[PDB]
């Protein structure tokens, strides 16, 4: 049994995490009470990866809900699948992080981090073979950004030989809460570079554009954006949650997707983009999958090169045709794949499709074009930091200007590292 411990921190991390558990509980036939009511035994072959079996054939998610405010977690407990989580796994504070990285990471989250690790330890001790942890959070706030990275750093100290995986939501001025989001994002990115094995870069700018340009939504809400995240998270965990001839685990993904330890930020993609009765052919799935308009990272793949690519097709389809279309993409646009990593595109097919779709495809790409995302964050960071604007919110929590300068340098170094492998 290769179990995964799920952690969700902050408002964004819990709302996105709650939707993720709502989606995959439906896929595994788990009702909000926690009882299995499915048909196929394939829904329970690897149910232990994300669920713990309780007395009376009850399935409880191996999830830990963390926040410095009680508001969002009260919504989750009152949500559709709120009754499925362990009451013990609700670890929350009262003051909040105030959209401040320092409060999450240094002052307010420090008071709460130890109690979270006790729940992490309680879940890890009851695992036959713990393969790692996955964290859902945003980088532009204070709790998921500040405390989440603090949790990652402390979890690595206690579990150094386990895989750290994150679903990290990048801030964007298009969908913005505070002007200090570039500060929080730049501080978090430096943490993610050193302490995570795989990070799915979910850009709120990309999610907004997909809802606006593609799905034709004039005023997208966070629910609309989180619908795209749920589809992506379900897709990128399909190989973990469903049986296949690949025996997929987190470590194997990291070994094959990450050729250099710091370049572990993946571009997720999904097809078809949904917000609907016509079936999608395999050539259509492959074309949309590599299309920039289906990318969740707001980067143009044609502006860089793919180091490694992992693709997941879901539904009853011709595996012969899937290999035809995947090879067609590589042989056509071979200039967008590195020629010094042979066979850097992996394809897996799962017979069980997501809810409401006959055919779907999920894209996981380690493209050097992701530097555009870090360039965008860096430019927004520098424009404020050159004038030391809003810095008092952080120096009042004990931080120093030097820490921001180091984070800025690490951010620009990461762009330099992604740039050298583009030639």
């Amino acid at each position: 049994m290769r179990e995964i411990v799920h952690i969700q921190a902050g408002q964004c991390g819990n709302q996105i995490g709650a939707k993720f558990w709502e989606v995959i509980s439906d896929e595994h036939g788990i009702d909000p009470t926690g009882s299995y009511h499915g048909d196929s035994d394939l829904q329970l072959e690897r149910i232990n990866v994300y669920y713990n079996e309780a007395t009376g054939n009850k399935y409880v998610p191996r999830a830990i809900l963390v926040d410095l405010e009680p508001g969002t977690m009260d919504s989750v407990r009152s949500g559709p699948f709120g009754q499925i989580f362990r009451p013990d796994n609700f670890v929350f504070g009262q003051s909040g992080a105030g959209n401040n990285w320092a409060k999450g990471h240094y002052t307010e989250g420090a008071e709460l981090v130890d109690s979270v690790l006790d729940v992490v330890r309680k879940e890890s001790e009851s695992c036959d073979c713990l393969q790692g942890f996955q964290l859902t959070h945003s980088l532009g706030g204070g709790t998921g950004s500040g405390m989440g990275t603090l949790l990652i750093s402390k979890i690595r100290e206690e579990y150094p030989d386990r895989i750290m995986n994150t679903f990290s939501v990048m801030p964007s001025p298009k969908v913005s809460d505070t002007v200090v989001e570039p500060y929080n994002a730049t501080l978090s990115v430096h943490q993610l570079v050193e302490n995570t094995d795989e990070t799915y870069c979910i850009d709120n700018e990309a999610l907004y554009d997909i809802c606006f340009r593609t799905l034709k939504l004039t005023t997208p809400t966070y629910g609309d954006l989180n619908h795209l995240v749920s589809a992506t998270m379900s897709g990128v965990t399909t190989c973990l949650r469903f049986p296949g001839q690949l025996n997929a685990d987190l470590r194997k993904l990291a070994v094959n997707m990450v050729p250099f330890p710091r370049l572990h930020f993946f571009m997720p993609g999904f097809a078809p983009l949904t917000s609907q009765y016509r079936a999608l052919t395999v050539p259509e799935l492959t074309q949309q999958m590599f299309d920039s308009k289906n990318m969740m990272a707001a980067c143009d793949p044609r502006h860089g090169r793919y180091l490694t690519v992992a693709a997941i097709f879901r539904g009853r389809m011709s595996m012969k045709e899937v290999d035809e279309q995947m090879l067609n993409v590589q042989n056509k646009n071979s200039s967008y794949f590195v020629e010094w990593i042979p066979n850097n595109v992996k394809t897996a097919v799962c017979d069980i499709p997501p809810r409401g779709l006959k055919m779907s495809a999920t894209f996981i790409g380690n493209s050097t074009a992701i530097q555009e995302l870090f360039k965008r964050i860096s430019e927004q960071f520098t424009a404020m930091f050159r004038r030391k604007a809003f810095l008092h919110w952080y120096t009042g929590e004990g931080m120093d200007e030097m820490e921001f300068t180091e984070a800025e340098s690490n951010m620009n170094d990461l762009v330099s590292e992604y740039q050298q492998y583009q030639d």
Binding site: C129, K252, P259, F260, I341
Partner: protein, 438 residues
């Protein structure tokens, strides 16, 4: 009677070994519960098939095999398969987490924790042998367990069984059916550390087997079951001499004598014919000359290469079925004029021929049709160096950027071991050229 111990390491070794022992039981008439009705000596006997099967007091014929994998999923299929009653649980060894396609993780980190246990279980079988010939090691180049742990095992076997031969059946990596992007790294590392320990290695390129299944068996997308059932036929032909009465390749030492003139050049090229789809109603049964001629067609070789551009050092013809020596000699004279078979000057241009009257056995309901005669050719050709060149070029592309190297260093490997392993491969290609120069 001199026994042989088969060792299956990693997913490829276990599943291919599962197919081989399934075929062995069919060929020897052994039932899935280990009962062999034709065996009259119950609990004993020094027959030819006893080199692969031990006999219990209850008459159950137990294979002389050990299955090793750092992950339990694959071997659990053997524990709950049709032939679960064959083995006993001491022969099946499983870990908890696999090597994650990492040679270092299977050799230095996770292999070091299980190497002593496997040797103990091997010794349990070695003590049941009156005279042990050696070991047949099944593994893949690409897998972390198949590459990392095998090389560690081969090092220890050369220390504890220094007077015993070791033969390898190795799965050469192919993108058509692959599992990792670091397989070129693992393939080079495991060949460097096993080269001085393996006496004779039969490489099976998954690309060749994949194409044969598509071309000859009309399989759209061949599965591991399709590939392994075809591979077991080649393995059965190679090991048929050890399990049946005969005079050619009767012991493991004879494989090195007949096929390996230079110790480092110990990779004979295997070619098999005929591969006939069972879906066809009745295909024309090919003649001795027709199947022998197919041995010199690249499309039937286990490794895609061009023997015309490479000198021969040795050649064996292992026929199974309705074959008489008069037909074989007539076929050879015809082939030597049409084909360009150039041996090296320091070797006699000749052919060692072995015939087994029992026709090839096929799995009931399988994809391979029953034929009245088949041949497997074992030719030590310098043309097999093309496979090393392909593998070394992919190695050089990734290593020039040091891609994925940190995963190996993080397990204790040194970056210099990569270059040391690669320079040995460069020397191996030099040795092949020095023998195949015009």
């Amino acid at each position: 009677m001199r026994e042989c111990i088969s060792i299956h390491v990693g997913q490829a070794g276990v599943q291919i070994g599962n197919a081989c022992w399934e075929l062995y039981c069919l060929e020897h008439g052994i039932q899935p519960d280990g009962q062999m009705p034709s065996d009259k000596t119950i609990g004993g006997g020094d027959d030819s098939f006893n080199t692969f099967f031990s006999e219990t007091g209850a008459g159950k014929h137990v294979p002389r095999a050990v299955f090793v994998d750092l992950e339990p999923t694959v071997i659990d299929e053997v524990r709950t398969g049709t032939y679960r009653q064959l083995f006993h649980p001491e022969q099946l060894i499983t870990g908890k987490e696999d090597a994650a396609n990492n040679y270092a993780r299977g050799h230095y980190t996770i292999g070091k924790e299980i190497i002593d246990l496997v040797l103990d279980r091997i010794r349990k079988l070695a003590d049941q042998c009156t005279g042990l010939q050696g070991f047949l090691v099944f593994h893949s180049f690409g897998g972390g367990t198949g590459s990392g742990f095998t090389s560690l095992l081969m090092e220890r076997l050369s220390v504890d069984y220094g007077k015993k031969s070791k033969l390898e059946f190795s799965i050469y990596p192919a993108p058509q059916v692959s599992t990792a992007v670091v397989e070129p790294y693992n393939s080079i590392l495991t060949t460097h550390t096993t080269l001085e320990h393996s006496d004779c290695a039969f490489m099976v390129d998954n690309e060749a087997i994949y194409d044969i299944c598509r071309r000859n068996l009309d399989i759209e997308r061949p599965t591991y079951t399709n590939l392994n059932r075809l591979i077991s036929q080649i393995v059965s032909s190679i090991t048929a001499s050890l399990r049946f009465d005969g005079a050619l390749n009767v012991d493991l030492t004879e494989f090195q004598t007949n096929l390996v003139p230079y110790p480092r050049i110990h990779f004979p090229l295997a070619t098999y014919a005929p591969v006939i789809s069972a879906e066809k109603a009745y295909h024309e049964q090919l003649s001795v000359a027709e199947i022998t001629n197919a041995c010199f067609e690249p499309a039937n070789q286990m490794v895609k290469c061009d023997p015309r551009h490479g000198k021969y050092m040795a050649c064996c013809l292992l026929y199974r079925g309705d074959v008489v020596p008069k037909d074989v000699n007539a076929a050879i004279a015809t082939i030597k004029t049409k084909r360009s078979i150039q041996f090296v000057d320091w070797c006699p241009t000749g052919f060692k021929v072995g015939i087994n009257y029992q026709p090839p056995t096929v799995v009931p309901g399988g994809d391979l049709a029953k034929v009245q005669r088949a041949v497997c050719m074992l030719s030590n050709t310098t043309a097999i160096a093309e496979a090393w060149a392909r593998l070394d070029h992919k190695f050089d592309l990734m290593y020039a950027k040091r891609a994925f190297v940190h995963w190996y260093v993080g397990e204790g490997m040194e970056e210099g071991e990569f270059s040391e392993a690669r320079e040995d491969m460069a020397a191996l290609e030099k040795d092949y050229e020095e023998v195949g120069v015009d």
